[PDB]
Every structure is written in structure tokens, then in C-alpha cells.
Design a protein around this motif. Structure first.
Motif, PDB file in Angstrom:
ATOM      1  N   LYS C   9       0.878  -1.252  -0.175  1.00 27.63           N
ATOM      2  CA  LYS C   9      -0.095   0.158  -0.015  1.00 27.63           C
ATOM      3  C   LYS C   9       0.782   1.342   0.083  1.00 27.63           C
ATOM      4  O   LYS C   9       2.117   1.201  -0.193  1.00 27.63           O
ATOM      5  CB  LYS C   9      -0.813  -0.162   1.126  1.00 27.63           C
ATOM      6  N   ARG C  10       0.190   2.346   0.218  1.00 31.58           N
ATOM      7  CA  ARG C  10       0.942   3.728   0.278  1.00 31.58           C
ATOM      8  C   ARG C  10       1.104   3.966   1.835  1.00 31.58           C
ATOM      9  O   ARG C  10       0.099   3.493   2.775  1.00 31.58           O
ATOM     10  CB  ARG C  10       0.249   4.681  -0.547  1.00 31.58           C
ATOM     11  N   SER C  11       2.047   4.934   2.188  1.00 30.31           N
ATOM     12  CA  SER C  11       1.968   5.510   3.562  1.00 30.31           C
ATOM     13  C   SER C  11       0.979   6.366   3.835  1.00 30.31           C
ATOM     14  O   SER C  11       0.151   6.692   3.212  1.00 30.31           O
ATOM     15  CB  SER C  11       3.227   6.487   3.553  1.00 30.31           C
ATOM     16  N   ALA C  12       0.737   6.929   5.179  1.00 29.29           N
ATOM     17  CA  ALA C  12      -0.189   8.071   5.573  1.00 29.29           C
ATOM     18  C   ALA C  12       0.103   9.201   4.873  1.00 29.29           C
ATOM     19  O   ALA C  12      -0.784  10.014   4.870  1.00 29.29           O
ATOM     20  CB  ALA C  12      -0.294   7.909   6.960  1.00 29.29           C
ATOM     21  N   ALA C  67     -33.885 -18.609  22.746  1.00 27.14           N
ATOM     22  CA  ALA C  67     -33.200 -18.058  23.924  1.00 27.14           C
ATOM     23  C   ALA C  67     -34.100 -18.063  25.212  1.00 27.14           C
ATOM     24  O   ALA C  67     -33.661 -18.583  26.203  1.00 27.14           O
ATOM     25  CB  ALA C  67     -32.912 -16.501  23.572  1.00 27.14           C
ATOM     26  N   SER C  68     -35.242 -17.240  25.219  1.00 25.88           N
ATOM     27  CA  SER C  68     -35.938 -16.975  26.319  1.00 25.88           C
ATOM     28  C   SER C  68     -36.584 -18.215  26.802  1.00 25.88           C
ATOM     29  O   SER C  68     -37.033 -18.201  28.357  1.00 25.88           O
ATOM     30  CB  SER C  68     -37.257 -16.210  25.797  1.00 25.88           C
ATOM     31  N   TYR C  82     -32.611 -11.522   3.906  1.00 26.85           N
ATOM     32  CA  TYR C  82     -32.017 -10.202   4.346  1.00 26.85           C
ATOM     33  C   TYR C  82     -30.486 -10.262   4.650  1.00 26.85           C
ATOM     34  O   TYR C  82     -30.046 -11.357   5.408  1.00 26.85           O
ATOM     35  CB  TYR C  82     -32.688  -9.371   5.466  1.00 26.85           C
ATOM     36  N   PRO C  84     -27.092  -7.671   5.301  1.00 27.54           N
ATOM     37  CA  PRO C  84     -26.749  -6.189   5.624  1.00 27.54           C
ATOM     38  C   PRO C  84     -25.452  -5.901   4.781  1.00 27.54           C
ATOM     39  O   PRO C  84     -25.376  -4.626   5.100  1.00 27.54           O
ATOM     40  CB  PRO C  84     -26.679  -5.909   7.063  1.00 27.54           C
ATOM     41  N   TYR C 170     -29.905 -18.667  15.982  1.00 27.21           N
ATOM     42  CA  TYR C 170     -30.903 -18.180  17.172  1.00 27.21           C
ATOM     43  C   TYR C 170     -31.931 -17.269  16.580  1.00 27.21           C
ATOM     44  O   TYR C 170     -32.033 -16.788  15.474  1.00 27.21           O
ATOM     45  CB  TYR C 170     -30.105 -17.264  18.147  1.00 27.21           C
ATOM     46  N   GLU C 175     -37.711  -7.292  20.074  1.00 33.11           N
ATOM     47  CA  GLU C 175     -36.825  -5.712  20.057  1.00 33.11           C
ATOM     48  C   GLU C 175     -36.295  -5.820  18.961  1.00 33.11           C
ATOM     49  O   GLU C 175     -36.172  -5.069  18.057  1.00 33.11           O
ATOM     50  CB  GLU C 175     -36.008  -5.702  21.216  1.00 33.11           C
ATOM     51  N   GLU C 176     -35.152  -6.785  18.613  1.00 30.05           N
ATOM     52  CA  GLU C 176     -34.499  -6.852  17.320  1.00 30.05           C
ATOM     53  C   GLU C 176     -35.270  -7.353  16.096  1.00 30.05           C
ATOM     54  O   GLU C 176     -35.250  -6.911  15.054  1.00 30.05           O
ATOM     55  CB  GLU C 176     -33.607  -8.172  17.351  1.00 30.05           C
ATOM     56  N   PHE C 179     -36.808  -4.351  14.549  1.00 31.59           N
ATOM     57  CA  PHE C 179     -36.034  -3.338  13.710  1.00 31.59           C
ATOM     58  C   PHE C 179     -36.216  -4.007  12.245  1.00 31.59           C
ATOM     59  O   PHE C 179     -36.421  -3.450  11.242  1.00 31.59           O
ATOM     60  CB  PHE C 179     -34.623  -3.397  14.096  1.00 31.59           C
ATOM     61  N   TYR C 180     -35.952  -5.341  12.373  1.00 30.77           N
ATOM     62  CA  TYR C 180     -35.526  -6.128  11.132  1.00 30.77           C
ATOM     63  C   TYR C 180     -36.795  -6.194  10.073  1.00 30.77           C
ATOM     64  O   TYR C 180     -36.661  -6.064   8.954  1.00 30.77           O
ATOM     65  CB  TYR C 180     -34.963  -7.579  11.135  1.00 30.77           C
ATOM     66  N   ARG C 183     -37.458  -3.147   8.505  1.00 29.77           N
ATOM     67  CA  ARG C 183     -36.441  -3.045   7.322  1.00 29.77           C
ATOM     68  C   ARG C 183     -36.797  -4.038   6.188  1.00 29.77           C
ATOM     69  O   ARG C 183     -36.285  -4.062   5.328  1.00 29.77           O
ATOM     70  CB  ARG C 183     -34.968  -3.542   7.812  1.00 29.77           C
TER      71      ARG C 183
END
Lengths: 260, 140, 188
Positions: C9-12, C67-68, C82, C84, C170, C175-176, C179-180, C183
Motif C-alpha cells: 500500500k502507500r504510507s499515510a 433463547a427465552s 436479508y 446487511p 438463534y 426488540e430485534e 427493527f428487521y 427493514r
RNA sequence: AUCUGGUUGAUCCUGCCAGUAGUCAUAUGCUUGUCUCAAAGAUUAAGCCAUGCAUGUCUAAGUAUAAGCAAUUUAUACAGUGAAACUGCGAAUGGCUCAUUAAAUCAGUUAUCGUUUAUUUGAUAGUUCCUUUACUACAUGGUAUAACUG
RNA sequence: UAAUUCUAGAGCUAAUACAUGCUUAAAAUCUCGACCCUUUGGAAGAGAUGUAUUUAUUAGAUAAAAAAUCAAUGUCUUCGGACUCUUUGAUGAUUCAUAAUAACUUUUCGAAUCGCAUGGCCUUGUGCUGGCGAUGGUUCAUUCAAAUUUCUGCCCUAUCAACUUUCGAUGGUAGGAUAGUGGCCUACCAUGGUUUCAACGGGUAACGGGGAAUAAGGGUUCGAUUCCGGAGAGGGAGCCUGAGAAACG
RNA sequence: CCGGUCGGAUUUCCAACGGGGCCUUUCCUUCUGGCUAACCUUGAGUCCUUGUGGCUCUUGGCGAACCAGGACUUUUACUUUGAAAAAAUUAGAGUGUUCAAAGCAGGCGUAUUGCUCGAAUAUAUUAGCAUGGAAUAAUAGAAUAGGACGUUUGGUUCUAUUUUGUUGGUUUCUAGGACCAUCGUAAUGAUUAAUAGGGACGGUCGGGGGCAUAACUACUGCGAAAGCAUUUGCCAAGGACGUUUUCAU
RNA sequence: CAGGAUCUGCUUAGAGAAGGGGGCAACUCCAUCUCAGAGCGGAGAAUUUGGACAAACUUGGUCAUUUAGAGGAACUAAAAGUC
């Protein structure tokens, strides 16, 4: 390189072995074992550069193959096995028993001991952990692991090990005013006692040690090996007993002693 | 606001049971950094999620400690620190000035504008050119 | 091959670097395995040291987890809705981490009746002796049972299949899932 | 801790060119009796290369029906020595050159709570016939090939 | 076959090679539940539990005192139930070590090996036990290592003043890949990062240091070359076997 | 000075030279715990003239040495001492290789089965780490006080360590975190005014400049420089002097 | 991503059907002449689909050199005629 290295050149050999710089081109390279590389001494530097028993390399292998030389009650034939600090070297056809311990000018000293002191060995405590299936162990400075200790042992303490069954008799804590050997650095081989120890979080901790003639010095924490309570060690110390003599004091003490 | 990215955002392995009910907001997790550093108020009770924060994320702090003044805040969650020293030239018996810029990471618990002076500590490689993140702050 | 050096790569600064040594074996990459769905095909690769990794070239089942309730059973997987990172894996149905798939809900439903005795949707004395015990823990979230009419749950993958070989995960919860699902039905 | 020759008819200066010693600093010229110690195809062409050598290895203790030898004898499975070959380990160390490479290498200094590790040294393993001893060996299951003969 | 450490067909027999595969103490605890007839029930029987692999979810306490309370109970029952009851490692710092619960797997390991000696016990059966040590084996520690990384430090040149970002340049989020961190690579987004305290470019008949010659003091000039570090094997690229090589006998 | 003597004591005093310590209106800024010695508190043990004598026993106040939690507190430059900067080489101590350059050896007795000394020390030489000092030279703090101290008082919160054996279900205090008004005491809080610099102010001076309308020229005039000569009036600029004005480059 | 020269352990028909007992005569009984059937398996060479990693080749377009001659214009000698 590509793999491990396997030769040690002569000028790169560790200085306190005192190999002379003209006899050959390489030095003995110590095997992988209990003690570190530049902190140990193979069995060929002992048996031909200290006791002067053997005159070659071919003579040392003739001694080791007759199954004379033990370390810690166990026979070794590795011609560069790495014997280090506090190890016990028991020959048999002379009834001599040795213990590896430090000189004062910084060397490994020849030390003869009894037939009863050669039944045990100290060792400090490098870590203490909880192993698999919930049992704990303890790791010494030479690498012995020992399961089931007392709970009051912590790190940097000192255990006493019985060389017969590989077990613990008793132990010494680590606090102010104890007898301490110094096993690395500049003040290497001096014996004194603890004044106090200050601590730096995330750094290297420093102890302050007083001699018997009451002159003080400072080293890092890991070069400090506990021996016993004050005035009472657990091992047979060498002559001088870890007292630093100035170079002025040791010309004339050699002069007046020169009456032969 | 805290959910702008295209995948769901959480401190991992922190479970919320919907069957139970407790008037806390969410079971937040937070740690003590060490070295006599103080976790700020806005991290324990705040609502951001950041992967790379010293008091919330999974990084450690160990190694060096530096100090310097902040000279650019134009990126998203990084800033740039300027450090200044002198350098001795033995033939001429004198000094000359030098400097070096370092980039660090800024947790959203802190609020740093330009001209301030921070102290920073070292963590494992975070980006191409980043190995420190802020741990204290004092204003201008 | 694919190398992971930073010496190309190149330097900073932007200064173009220089060719320093030849390419060293201890910085290597391999080829990306894409993981289709089908009968079990798993290949083994040999790593640094004498170790071993299992590349999964296509599989069809898994081991998913409630889970629960705290029960994890073994089911089948159907298809991804889906992803992301890019949506060219949803149009090909690969299997990565953080992919959202659909499973068949049958053994969880069959467990649920055995544990409680209550339906989803719409005789020894040992059983109701303990069915009376698990009385308060009976009801669940609405928005998760509301797909038991179709048997297609929503679940994310938490195992790397190209490394470990397997593919587990899972179940999405509310809650999750809020969101989805917002989406899911809006970004198309 | 040192200076001398050269500008003008004569004198004071600025100023440079000769001189004078040293070199583990290389060649070269003429000479050359003794003891001790010894560098030596780097510069130019990291140009080209005839022949030979420089990496193999066995203990009472993995595999011997050599149509090997020794025969010598208590030994009807074998037992002394011991080529060839399978299996195990090593060949990644050592030795040689200085072409590339200017924040790279490299030095003194930190970090791994960010990872792999043959070996060595010390600990460490009643649960595994469908079984808790029901058909189906644990006084012990199955093929394939090497050297060798043709 | 003119040929090279070239090899074909037919016939034999071994292993610490290759492929399989048994044995063993008692205890506890879980789930299922034949029955039982009952109150406040208790029960035969069954199966499950080594270690390793992958995912999820709990334990991994600790700054100073006393009541009212909702019931339940260990207990003298005082048939009121008042009470006459808790352990917990290490670090400056962790989602650390370590333990449990549901499971999961082209099911990992748990001695079908070898030399010496030759004894003790008996119902005397080649019955039963029994010494020293070689080689192999899973995981944690350890030793020889390896791979990356923090701070400051390089010779001449402005007749080189602006450079980098399609083709990753500087940062954010999620995946892929690796022994592992990381624009190392791929997706979507932001518009950054270096500079007169000399960036970027050009020269080097430049491998870097320990060190070497000269020396009142300050300094000037060297270091291809006996030790440590890197690179290379006619020039570039690619991979096999292995703990370890992008290896050149 | 003293020697005092079968060179080393110094009874014993002096001059300097460096170091502690307290007191003077005045240095760590504290807190909670152990904790050890020590003063003391209810008060005797202990043993010495008999003791609340100390020593130390008992309750109790404490400073006092050490560990542990703290608790908060401007930041550098420089300098002092320490740990840690491989060996070889360099300065160098010991040592008749027959001397030497070298080497790390060697020396002594009965030589008749022996004892015995060595293989030192120095060389921060940038950057990092530990520590002593407060000169020199920088830097921060109260001016619209949201300033500092208060055991002035009203608050808003947040934790439950404890006890109501225990368990979970409640809230009462209590401690324990911060923030919220006003009520009290301190001497409440602003370095000079450079024979540095700027800015006003008053009377003047000059072939200084722009618009309009020679002689005096050296002896000396003005302007940053090149330069600058007829009277009258406009437009602005500038030095020096004078001053118990102003700002703190 | 495919491909299957060749080896291969198997189950199981079953007629060929051999020899002892039983209409003893094929045959039928486990007391073995000569084989056509399939049933599920395993190992696996030549060849081929798409990738990333990439040495090289061809082609012009630009520079640096070299080299061959080529055309040049000047000055000078153990060189030199003159206005």
C-alpha cells in the motif's frame, strides 16, 4: 532463517562461563530444558572446565554413559543438559554432592554440601492458577508444576521441594525483613534483607535491600529470591556470603593474607 | 439515531428476557479501565453503542501513555493530536524544534473541540494508522 | 497468492513504497468459499501448525436455539431474506455470518405442546401434575407466535461456516425483530 | 598545543601553490639471513563455468527363512553376526556474497487482555460391546505391497 | 531403448506402515414416568451424563446499621409458623481462568506395540498375581523459537512547492480470508489524510550497527570484510511435503 | 591541641567545611481502616523509694511506624543519583610467554595417591524508566464573581450494603451519590508606570507632497530612497520639543 | 463445476447343476462338475466448467542510448607556401 538455530559461535557464548577465546570456533549450545539459555550451564562446562575431571568431549560422554551423574535424583546423559540455579548434582563413585549457587563476582560456584542437605531444593513461585477440573497448581522457577497447594501461598513466595517424591514440606512468605538472594543483573550474588518495596502500576517494581554492613541498593522485583528469615538461611551459603568488597579492600586483604 | 447503520447494534452476549419484566432500561455493561482512570458519567448511563470504546467496548489499555493538543476533529470518531519537543545537536551545542502528529480514537462519551489537550493510552491496532484512544480530557 | 502484507500500500503521506523482499508463505490468503444450500458437501483444509479447518461447500440443516425458553433443537433451513452487507447474497442464497434465514418451525411446536399442553394459533396424572406447575410461564410474545400458522420463523446465523464447517444460530425476538421487520417490508 | 621556500630594487600585508609527518590503505620498483603471529578474486563483470567432492543415519529395546557368513551347538517358532528394502527422524542448521533497499533495514526501547509452535523438562486419561455385561474373538480381527526369484 | 539415480508385465511374505475394533470400582444427580389413592401424595421401571468440536444462555459476590411487610418452610412445635443458617480465585484492568444447563459433529483421543529379568501365592491348573524401561498419546504449563507492534534517531539536492483519492488514498458499519489483529480484501456510506519545523520527487561508484584511522580541546573522514540483524541463490512468478520453506547441493 | 607509645588509641577541647532540627503571622492538603511502638484514659499489673510513674494490663483518647482503600491536587524545560545499555575491541588491575607483541594463565610441599589464589574495575554516549532539588526561562488561576470557605437552612436524586433465620413479594428509616435556592465570615478579590513602544494635547518649524494661481543655494533646511527653489490660497501628512493625561504593544 | 479407462468387497436370484442319504433315477437334502441374473457399495487416472494469482508475447505511441556511414562547420603541430 527458516527454522530454529542450532550452533552457538564462540564469542557469542555467555561470558560467565569463561571459555577461552582461542581453543575453537563454536561453543556448547544448551538444549531446551528447564532453565533459560543465558541463565544456565551445561554439563560439559561443569565436568571439564570446573572440576577438571575430563579432558575432552570424548571423555565426558564416556563418563555420562556409565550412568554416574544424576541431577535431582534422576540420571541424565544429555551432554548439554541445562543445569541452572539451585540444582543438585550427585556423583556416586566419589560420594560428593554439589549445589549450583552464585559466586559474588557473578559466577557459578563449586559448592560441596552434605549428604543430608542434598535431599531437598527451594524454588520460587512464578504463577498460581486454577487448572482443568477445578484443581489448582503452582509453577516454580525451574518449571515444576505441583497440584494441590495450601491456599495461603501467593506468587513471589518460596516453596521447599522434597526431591524424593516431588512434594512440599513448608513455605516462606514475602514481606519486609527477610533473607534474600539476588539472581540477576548487576548486584548479582549479593545477600541482604528487605527494607521495603514500592509499586508502580503497569511497570517494574523496585525493592530496597540492606546488606549486613548496612549499605543499600535497589533492583527490580523479579531478580529477588527469598531464602529465609533474618540470620537464618535454609541452604549452605558460600564463602564471603554475598558481601560486596571494594577493590581497595581486596588488594590488601590479599596482601596480608599472603603469608601462605 | 443510535440505529442508523444497516444492521442491528448491541453489546454482544448481553441478553434481554422479554418474559421477565424489570423497570431498568436495558442491561448495560461497562468496565473499569485501570491505572487510576475514572469512567465518566455519560458512559454508564448513556445510550450509544460503540465497538471500540475503552469503557464499553472490547479493547484493553496497556503499553505507553502520551499527551498532546488536538488540532483536527473532522472525521467520524477520530481526531488528530500534535506533539512538540526539541532535539539536541552536539557539535553546535544547541536545540532545534520538531513535531509529530498522531491520530487517535474518540469515544462518544467525551466532547472534544479543537485547541484542547488530552491524554491518551495505547490499545491493539484499530485501523490502518491508529493505536491510541482518549482516556481523559482537560479544556483550553 | 493472496497475500496480506501492508508493504504494497502507500504510507499515510502518499509516498509510494518499494519492493523489499519476495512473498513470504506466512502471509497468505485462500479463496472465499461461498456456501450454497443442498446436500452435505464439506471439505477439509490444512492450516499453520498441524491443525485443520472444515470448509462447507453446501449444506442444508443446522442447530438453532430458543433463547427465552432456553432450548436448542436441530432443524432445517429454507432461504435467506436479508443480508446487511450486499444484496447479491440474498439473490444467490449463500451462507455467511449475520445472514437472516427461514427455518421450519415443526420441532419447536412439537416441543411446546409437550412442555405445556397448549396449542399454537386458533393423559397420565403425572402430566397435569406438572402442567399445573408451568402455568404462569405459558403465554409468549404475540409477534413471534403469529408466524406459527406458516411454520417459517426468522433467525440469524452466528457461526462462521467457512471456518468451522457448521451453521447454527438463534431466533429473532421482538426488540430485534421490530427493527428487521420494518427493514424487511420497506427496503424492497 | 611548533611551522619553513615562492610576488618587490628594498619593506610590511591579503592570499593561494611546493614542502613536512600518519594510515589494520591498495598497487607497484629494487633489494631480502633468523624466531614468533598471520590477511589474502571485495572494488572492475550479483559475468560465464570442464572434472571430483561438500547430507545422511541403528541401539539388548519397530520389520530379517539373504538360496550371506559363522558354525557354534542345549533350544522344532525365532535367538550369533548381518548386506538390500519398508517404516521413523533429519535435509529449514551450517558455509558464501553484498545486487536491491533512504522512515525501509537497523539500533537502544516497549506490547501481545492480539496469535502458531516438532522437541525438552513437570503434571495429566476406571465412564468408549446394542451394552452395565443379551447374538456378534480380546488367550488378541482384515487385507495389500517392498527387497528377492523369473 | 543409442541413451540418465528410466522402468513394464507375471509370481511370493512381514510391521510402532495402512484399515478396523472389546474390556472395568462403587457412588450420586437428573429428567421421563407403570401403578397407587389419596391427601399437602409417593412410586416401580426406564434412559442421560469422560474428553474434544460449534452456537446460545446463567455463576464468576463484596464500601455501614434497624424495622413494618407477602407467604413459605430447617427446626423446640410454642402447628403461631416467629425463627434456633451460608461459600466465592487471580489482575493496574476483562465477556479471565474455571463450573453448570440444552444440544450439535462426513465423531477427535482413552497403549490389538518392544527388551530384560524371573520371582511370590495356592485348591498344581502351563491357576492367579508380580520387577525394572523402551517407544507412542490428548490437553494445560514450560524451554528453543516465530509473526506482527509502541516511542525517538539517517548522507547530498529547491536548476524538485505542492503531493495522495477512477485502479483504497484517510475514517465509520457488516461480511470474507488468516495462526491471529488490521482497507489485508469485498459492499454500501462519509471527505478526509501529508506539507517551509522541507512533505512529494531526483542522485547515491549506499546493506545497517558493534567498531576503524587521525587526535590540546572541539572535530574531519571511513565501516564490501572473523560477532549480532536483514536480503539473495542466472532473471521474474507459482506451489508440493512438513512443527517449520513461497527452499533453489 | 593532645602521644598518654608494652604510627594506633584520644581522656578532651578548638577553627573552618558541608548536614539535620525546631520557633518565629509561614508546607504534604487530607480520609477510613487495620496496624505496630508510643503518650495517656477507668485503673492496676510490672518491679524498682510507696504510684492513673512509665514499663505497659484493663477500658479509653491520641500523635506515632506499616500495609490497604483512598481522597483530591496546573503543566514542562534543566540538573543530581539509581536501575537496565551482549561479547570482541579501547582506557586499565594482577601475572619473568627466556624479554616483547600476545595469552589468561599460574603458585607452593614430602612430590610418596597433596592442599591453594585468580579469571577484577571503569567508559548515558541521544530517546524511554525510577528519584532528589526549586535557581534560571516558559505556562495556569477570583473582574459581569456561576469566587473560596461554613457542622446557614429548604431540596432533587440515586445505592442498599445491613438487620425483620431463610426465600422471594412490598416500604419505613438509615446511611450513602450528585445536583437545587438563600443565610453566614473572611482586611473579600485588579504588581509597578522602563531616560521600551503606541495614543491623545498645546504652541511652532521646514526648497516635504498634490490642486489652483537666479543671487537667498552654505555656514546649512526637508524626505524611506530617487530626490526637493516665483508669489497667494486650499487639501491632508510628519520630526523634535513641552506635560503631576492615557493604555500595559 | 463435472467427468468414470480400471480395480473392488458385497447381498441375493437362479439355472448350469456336480458326489453321500431320500421316487435313491436326473433329483432332493449341506449331506460339491462347469455360471448367466440383478441388489446396494468403495477407491479412483486421462479429459473438462468458472475463478483468483500472474510469468511472458504481439502491436503501435513516446524517450535514452548506442552504433554504421552520412553531411558538417573550426582550431592547432620534433607543420607551412606570403601582401
Amino acid at each position: 532463517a527458516r527454522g530454529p538455530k542450532k550452533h552457538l559461535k564462540r564469542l557469542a557464548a555467555p561470558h560467565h562461563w569463561l571459555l577461552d577465546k582461542l581453543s575453537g570456533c563454536y561453543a556448547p549450545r544448551p538444549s531446551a530444558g528447564p532453565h533459560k539459555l543465558r541463565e544456565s550451564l551445561p554439563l560439559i562446562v561443569f565436568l571439564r572446565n570446573r572440576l577438571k575431571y575430563a579432558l575432552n568431549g570424548r571423555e565426558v560422554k564416556a563418563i555420562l554413559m556409565q550412568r554416574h551423574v544424576k541431577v535431582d535424583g534422576k540420571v541424565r546423559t544429555d551432554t548439554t543438559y541445562p543445569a541452572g540455579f539451585m540444582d543438585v548434582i550427585t556423583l556416586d563413585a566419589t560420594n560428593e554432592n554439589f549445589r549450583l549457587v552464585y559466586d559474588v563476582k557473578g559466577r557459578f560456584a563449586v559448592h560441596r554440601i552434605t549428604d543430608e542437605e542434598a535431599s531437598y531444593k527451594l524454588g520460587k513461585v512464578k504463577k498460581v492458577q486454577l487448572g482443568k477440573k477445578g484443581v489448582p497448581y503452582v509453577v516454580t522457577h525451574d518449571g515444576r508444576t505441583i497440584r494441590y497447594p495450601d491456599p495461603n501461598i501467593k506468587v513471589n513466595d518460596t516453596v521447599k521441594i522434597d526431591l524424593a517424591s516431588g512434594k512440599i514440606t513448608d513455605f516462606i512468605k514475602f514481606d519486609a525483613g527477610k533473607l534474600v538472594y539476588v539472581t540477576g543483573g548487576r548486584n548479582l550474588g549479593r545477600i541482604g534483607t528487605i527494607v521495603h518495596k514500592e509499586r508502580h502500576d503497569g511497570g517494574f517494581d523496585l525493592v530496597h535491600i540492606k546488606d549486613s554492613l548496612d549499605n543499600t541498593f535497589v533492583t527490580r522485583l523479579n531478580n529477588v529470591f527469598v531464602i529465609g528469615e533474618q540470620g537464618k538461611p535454609y541452604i549452605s551459603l558460600p564463602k564471603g556470603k554475598g558481601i560486596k568488597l571494594s577493590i581497595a579492600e581486596e588488594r590488601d586483604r590479599r596482601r596480608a593474607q599472603q603469608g601462605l | 439515531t443510535v440505529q442508523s447503520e444497516r444492521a442491528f447494534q448491541k453489546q454482544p452476549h448481553i441478553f434481554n428476557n422479554p418474559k421477565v419484566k424489570t423497570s431498568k432500561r436495558t442491561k448495560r455493561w461497562y468496565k473499569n479501565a485501570g491505572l487510576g482512570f475514572k469512567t465518566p458519567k455519560t458512559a454508564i448511563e448513556g445510550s450509544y453503542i460503540d465497538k471500540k470504546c475503552p469503557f464499553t467496548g472490547l479493547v484493553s489499555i496497556r503499553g505507553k501513555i502520551l499527551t498532546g493538543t488536538v488540532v483536527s476533529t473532522k472525521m467520524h470518531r477520530t481526531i488528530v493530536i500534535r506533539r512538540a519537543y526539541l532535539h539536541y545537536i552536539p557539535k553546535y551545542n544547541r536545540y532545534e524544534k520538531r513535531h509529530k502528529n498522531v491520530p487517535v480514537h474518540v469515544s462518544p462519551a467525551f466532547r472534544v473541540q479543537v485547541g484542547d489537550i488530552v491524554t491518551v493510552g495505547q490499545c491493539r491496532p484499530i485501523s490502518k494508522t491508529v493505536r491510541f484512544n482518549v482516556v481523559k480530557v482537560s479544556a483550553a | 497468492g493472496i497475500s496480506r502484507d501492508s508493504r504494497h500500500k502507500r504510507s499515510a503521506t502518499g509516498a509510494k513504497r518499494a519492493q523489499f523482499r519476495k512473498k513470504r508463505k506466512f502471509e497468505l490468503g485462500r479463496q472465499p468459499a461461498n456456501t450454497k444450500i443442498g446436500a452435505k458437501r464439506i471439505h477439509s483444509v490444512r492450516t499453520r501448525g498441524g491443525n485443520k479447518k472444515y470448509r462447507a461447500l453446501r449444506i442444508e440443516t443446522g442447530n438453532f436455539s430458543w433463547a427465552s425458553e432456553g432450548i436448542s433443537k436441530k432443524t432445517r433451513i429454507a432461504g435467506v431474506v436479508y443480508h446487511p452487507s450486499n444484496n447479491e447474497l440474498v439473490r444467490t442464497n449463500t451462507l455467511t455470518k449475520a445472514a437472516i434465514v427461514q427455518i421450519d418451525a415443526t420441532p419447536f411446536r412439537q416441543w411446546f405442546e409437550a412442555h405445556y399442553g397448549q396449542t399454537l394459533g386458533k393423559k397420565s396424572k403425572n402430566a397435569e401434575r406438572k402442567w399445573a406447575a408451568r402455568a404462569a410461564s405459558a403465554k409468549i410474545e404475540s409477534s413471534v407466535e403469529s408466524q406459527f400458522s406458516a411454520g417459517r420463523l426468522y433467525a440469524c446465523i452466528s457461526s462462521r461456516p467457512g471456518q468451522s464447517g457448521r451453521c447454527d444460530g438463534y431466533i429473532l425476538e421482538g426488540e430485534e425483530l421490530a427493527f428487521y421487520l420494518r427493514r424487511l417490508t420497506a427496503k424492497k
